[PDB]
Write a protein that binds this DNA or RNA. Sequence first.
DNA 1: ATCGCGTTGCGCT
DNA 2: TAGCGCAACGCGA
Length: 137
Amino acid sequence: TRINLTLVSELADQHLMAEYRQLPRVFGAVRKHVANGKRVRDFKISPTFILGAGHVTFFYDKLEFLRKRQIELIAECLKRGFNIKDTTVQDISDIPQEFRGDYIPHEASIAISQARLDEKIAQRPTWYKYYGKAIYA
DNA sequence: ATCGCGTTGCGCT
DNA sequence: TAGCGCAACGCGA
């Protein structure tokens, strides 16, 4: 799974879709632990953004950032006209507030997010499209 | 109607 | 501890 701090407006159509269906994977992971009775401090949450091991856990006390991000993601998808079935931002009022914090990415964390996108496109530049067209490559 | 491709970490056994 | 498969799907060829 992967969450980017990248502005959704410049996301490659593919990276935009992958994020649409991937982001919601965190709300569910948290709900499940909450079901298991786990608390936010029973998790090794990173002090700073990271990609890889510790990545999604990082977002375990930033459910707002994502919730809000979900609204942004949904918008862009519609703009480009992708027939998405879930046009509704999910209701996370059922989760202990300790998990629902906002998060203000630092300029350095974002650049890191970009780097990944920018090296994942390069693996297949002709294949990545923006609003239907292969602007990369 | 079908097939490849997009992420990759983390929860559970 | 180690390994395994899960977890918001829809588009272009």
